[PDB]
Amino acid sequence: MAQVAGAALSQAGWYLSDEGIEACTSSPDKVNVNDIILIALNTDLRTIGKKFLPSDINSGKVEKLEGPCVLQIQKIRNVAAPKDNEESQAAPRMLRLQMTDGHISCTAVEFSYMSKISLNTPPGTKVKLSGIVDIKNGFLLLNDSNTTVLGGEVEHLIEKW
Amino acid sequence: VMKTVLMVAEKPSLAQSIAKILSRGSLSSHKGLNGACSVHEYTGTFAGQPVRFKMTSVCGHVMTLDFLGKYNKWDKVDPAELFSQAPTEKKEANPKLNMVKFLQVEGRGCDYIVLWLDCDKEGENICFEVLDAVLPVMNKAHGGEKTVFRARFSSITDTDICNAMACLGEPDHNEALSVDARQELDLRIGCAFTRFQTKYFQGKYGDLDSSLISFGPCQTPTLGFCVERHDKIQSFKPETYWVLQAKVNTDKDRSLLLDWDRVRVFDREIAQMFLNMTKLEKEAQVEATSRKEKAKQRPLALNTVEMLRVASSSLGMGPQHAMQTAERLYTQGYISYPRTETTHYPENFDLKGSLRQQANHPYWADTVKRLLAEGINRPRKGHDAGDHPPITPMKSATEAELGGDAWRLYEYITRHFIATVSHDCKYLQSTISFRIGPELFTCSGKTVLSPGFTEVMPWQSVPLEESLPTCQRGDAFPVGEVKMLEKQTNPPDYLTEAELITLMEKHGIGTDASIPVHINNICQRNYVTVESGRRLKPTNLGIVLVHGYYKIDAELVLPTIRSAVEKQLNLIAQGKADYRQVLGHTLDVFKRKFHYFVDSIAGMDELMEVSF
DNA sequence: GACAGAT
Ligand SMILES: [Mn+2]
């Protein structure tokens, strides 16, 4: 819905392309922003996203993120435990999330215990970065005061060992 | 005229103890025709009549299974005939001790018989062996009266022994049959597999000629443990994790090494950014302080497994050597029975008196005198398995009286005994938490307040450390330096003898007197070589055998079949399954498994060709 | 010519 829908998505923090919003929508006769959100959480961001994250974010020249934006997790690894003993409790859990808006990729690190995100969080889940998020050496620093897990159900293919 | 009753036990010490308890100190003792077995005599009442009591003891098992003659030739028969068509008789074990002749001579004229064997399955089996040896030489039954009796006891105490003599029962043929089935199964599997393997590999590889390759329900899993550890060592990929430690100057010349709360980081860029946050920070900040007063628990009563573990780890002796030394000490009368799984002292044990014997040795004279003056501590409650009491010193000894190797085992045993009765080690744990930039660090230290059992066991002592400086929250301390360290994950080392004994105890492989033999057996057949630090390194022969078994039949190495088969044999003990069917059913299962092993033996050859 | 495990 043109300007009002664009403003609603912009305020909600979902930055999607014009083609993405015109395709991911359903029932063109009647739909609502909540319906677009519900159907968007279940779609891969790589096919519907729009370019918001500044270019060369992994260079260390950007130290701040302004505004709320929603990004999609690709893979999660516990950097405080070895590859074989991924569940080892000998060290506090620290997660290195890789995050995408569809085009550019960024890396975030768990700077403080996040109970919502775990090692079993499936790829494709959506996280909203509310507030000011600080980027040190190209690494976003995540906390409980700037990350909200909005869920998401996209084709997993995570499989197992 | 007075009827004589035989009172067979299982070991001379137990026979003497029970005779002393029952005879209230009116024994008449003389040695039998073995030297290792003694006959005690006294007088008492049985079934309301005056009778004479003849206490005797066997020296363990009396019989052992063996094939008749042909199936002992190794060339006239093939191993496949050792499962169903190989009759087995029972011959005499330890022929040096004329057990059958001694029992017959002692029973030459007895009327009744009371059988004081230890209350377990092997005890019942030896009970029926003794009964089969002694019955055909007795004085027969006048009428419908009973003749064979059984006494059940849980501990060697006056009240328990008197009660056991008060209430008498009958032996358990079901447990006897269960033990017989286990013995027959072990013989028929081990012999067949060994004669196939050693006669196949001696005809193809000349390096293995005049060498015995053996298979068994216990030694094969024992070797499999070490081979699994070797495989884990081989399939190891080291990593390059980074740590971050900082030094803080608390005083003008005092420096403290802090530890990162985030213990490790496996990403170089993440470690670098964390260091970047903490480079240009020259003022630390204290946040937390802890003064918890913990304690170190005193050791439990000495177990045979723990004794073997400590002898292998600290003293530096093999399991069989330690067992032989303990047996020599026990025979000489210095330590109590060294083959028990009881870690809980009896309620009537004379701790205060056994401690008073070790009151003149200069090594620990001060500790014992202080302990008896201010009272002793009640030993920790533990597991009572119905076996003999835990290994404790029974007589004073000096390094001159004992040798250079029996003294070291004695010294550890008596220092363990005092530790179990001494107090607990109380120490003060102090931690100070620091804020260096956006990160946190901790420094921990221990201060001993009142040493306890560490005085008699110095190796289990809290290491001496400098006391942490006194401070409260808000203090600012100059920061010395912050650095990263490129550490690497260390590969695991080869399995040690102490670690292997724990593994066998968990999986039920080997009893108290069989664990030392199995470790020595696989060492004598060149399966594993004992290295520095008592590490068991598998050889090329051991690796080929275990790896070959997994390819063909996993159920011959897995440390679970031994417990699984033992559970099946307990059905005969409880009467839920007859002895004939279970033995036949299990033999056919392994006989089918034997044929697959023979037909698929070409698998092990392709691994053996590389080595030899 | 040797074997198994157990006291
Ligand atoms: Mn026993």
Residue numbers in the entry:
A (entry chain B): 1 to 161
B (entry chain A): 0 to 611
Sentences from the paper on this structure:
Type IA topoisomerases (TopoIAs) are present in all living organisms. They resolve DNA/RNA catenanes, knots and supercoils by breaking and rejoining single-stranded DNA/RNA segments and allowing the passage of another nucleic acid segment through the break. Topoisomerase III-β (TOP3B), the only RNA topoisomerase in metazoans, promotes R-loop disassembly and translation of mRNAs. We present a series of cryo-EM structures of human TOP3B with its cofactor TDRD3 during cleavage and rejoining of DNA or RNA, thus elucidating the roles of divalent metal ions and key enzyme residues in each step of the catalytic cycle.
At relatively low divalent-cation concentration (e.g. <1 mM), the cleaved DNA or RNA intermediates dominate while increasing the divalent-cation concentration favors the rejoining reaction. The DNA cleaved state was visualized by cryo-EM of cTOP3B-DNA in 0.5 mM Mn2+ with the catalytic Y336 covalently linked to the DNA scissile phosphate. This post-cleavage TOP3B state exhibits a relatively relaxed conformation with separated DNA ends and displaced MnC2+. Yet, despite a strong preference for the C-5 base, TOP3B retains the flexibility to accommodate varied DNA bases surrounding C-5, as evidenced by the comparison of two structures of cTOP3B with different DNA substrates. Different DNA backbone and base-stacking configurations can affect the binding affinity of the structural cation MnS2+, as we could not detect MnS2+ in the cleavage state when TOP3B bound to a different DNA substrate, but it was consistently present in the rejoining complexes. These two different DNA substrates exhibit different conformations in the TOP3B DNA binding groove.
